[PDB]
Design a protein around this ligand. Structure first.
Ligand SMILES: Cc1cc2nc3c(=O)[nH]c(=O)nc-3n(C[C@H](O)[C@H](O)[C@H](O)COP(=O)(O)OP(=O)(O)OC[C@H]3O[C@@H](n4cnc5c(N)ncnc54)[C@H](O)[C@@H]3O)c2cc1C
Ligand SMILES: Cc1cc2nc3c(=O)[nH]c(=O)nc-3n(C[C@H](O)[C@H](O)[C@H](O)COP(=O)(O)OP(=O)(O)OC[C@H]3O[C@@H](n4cnc5c(N)ncnc54)[C@H](O)[C@@H]3O)c2cc1C
Ligand SMILES: NC(=O)c1ccc[n+]([C@@H]2O[C@H](COP(=O)([O-])OP(=O)(O)OC[C@H]3O[C@@H](n4cnc5c(N)ncnc54)[C@H](O)[C@@H]3O)[C@@H](O)[C@H]2O)c1
Ligand SMILES: NC(=O)c1ccc[n+]([C@@H]2O[C@H](COP(=O)([O-])OP(=O)(O)OC[C@H]3O[C@@H](n4cnc5c(N)ncnc54)[C@H](O)[C@@H]3O)[C@@H](O)[C@H]2O)c1
Lengths: 149, 149
């Protein structure tokens, strides 16, 4: 079921992020396309994390997390943090190295979201990688932007 | 202000949507990139609408709204509903005709989101348009996806 809903959302293109959190001995990363800018004042971003995600309890307990925006060529990173292991993929300094950008957030608020939890982060630090095209997901596949334009 | 934050978010590619609501014959439309799939069961989507958006009052009052996913070549529609009026642009049946897809939602919840409000919609109807490339926004500009024949 939900074929129509999925076909519709498959038609919404987006960049790809890796959301990560560290709580004690555990540090987890998870691939997420459900990400969006939320506020400028204060600087907030919103994400939807599955209630079934192992990342969730870690992020909740940590009270802070990072969001790395993947660039073109990082499909392997996305696949790895999406549950399809790739050799040698790892987080460095709590985030994805070589990403277009990294947002280090303090957990600002959480809200119910059906089978997902709405996670709101207050951006406290911003890391900017070198400019370039992003990793894009649209219609059930990784895509590239016609770049430059 | 918030130069780094803006630069980072400009690095998150996304499709472009037009959110609309109506109270009788008073109908408002607003361009938005802050949109994401939220839940499958129930089928929910989330978006961020500025607290100063004229659309918000109507959306709350209506308790329902639509989200149209724009396709490649609809930059004019995006600009129009972004506050820069264009010729011959109008909502039809409460949404944008000729879009990749339209989601007709019932307002499910409203949560605090800084200078924006988190709008959660319960998808009650889905409309799909012809297939094809989407309208993408990235690095302060409309972009096209590599999608050759
Ligand atoms: C394009 C795409 C977009 C997606 N968007 C979303 C979304 O917006 N929201 C959502 O809830 N789900 C999304 N998913 C699915 C989601 O990624 C999987 O359901 C989820 O990753 C499983 O995550 P988990 O935290 O439960 O961890 P696990 O099931 O354990 O999966 C995490 C994977 O990441 C690896 N990993 C975890 N931590 C580390 C670490 N510290 N170092 C190295 N490797 C590590 C693991 O080896 C494992 O394979 C998306 C999937 C794809 C393919
Ligand atoms: C690429 C892009 C992405 C954006 N994403 C977001 C976002 O995610 N969230 C956000 O809050 N803001 C976003 N904005 C800015 C936002 O679009 C403007 O702040 C907002 O449109 C002003 O909305 P308003 O509802 O107050 O209406 P207005 O300032 O009145 O703007 C709405 C425009 O739509 C037209 N319009 C309204 N109703 C109708 C109708 N029934 N028929 C025909 N035309 C109509 C108007 O003529 C007007 O020009 C984005 C802007 C751009 C350029
Ligand atoms: N937001 C998410 O939770 C999310 C986003 C994309 C991918 N995924 C996972 O990857 C699989 C493949 O995705 P695809 O886009 O290639 O094909 P798909 O047809 O399974 O999904 C199409 C779109 O529908 C939405 N969606 C699908 N499953 C969802 C879920 N469980 N919760 C919320 N939204 C969902 C997402 O926007 C997804 O991109 C999905 O079935 C899901 O397991 C999860
Ligand atoms: N989510 C939003 O509210 C949103 C999204 C994009 C565009 N816009 C409007 O269009 C203008 C141009 O944007 P641009 O991307 O071409 O260059 P920009 O540098 O002005 O914006 C960069 C990115 O930061 C985020 N952002 C910017 N202003 C925001 C705001 N007021 N609230 C929440 N997030 C914000 C968005 O993701 C935007 O794409 C922005 O200044 C803004 O007025 C608003």
């Amino acid at each position: 079921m939900k074929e129509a809903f999925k076909e519709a959302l498959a038609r919404f293109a987006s960049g790809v992020t890796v959301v990560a959190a560290r709580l004690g001995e555990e540090e987890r990363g998870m691939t997420a396309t459900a990400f969006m800018s939320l506020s400028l004042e204060p600087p907030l971003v919103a994400l939807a994390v599955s209630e079934r995600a192992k990342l969730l309890p870690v992020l909740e307990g940590a009270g802070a997390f990072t969001v790395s925006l993947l660039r073109e060529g990082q499909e392997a990173v996305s696949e790895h943090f999406a549950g399809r292991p790739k050799e040698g993929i790892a987080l460095e300094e709590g985030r994805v190295k070589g990403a277009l950008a990294v947002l280090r957030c303090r957990l600002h608020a959480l809200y119910p979201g059906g089978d997902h939890r709405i996670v709101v982060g207050l951006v406290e630090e911003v890391e900017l990688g070198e400019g370039g095209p992003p990793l894009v997901y649209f219609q059930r596949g990784y895509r590239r932007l016609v770049w430059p334009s």
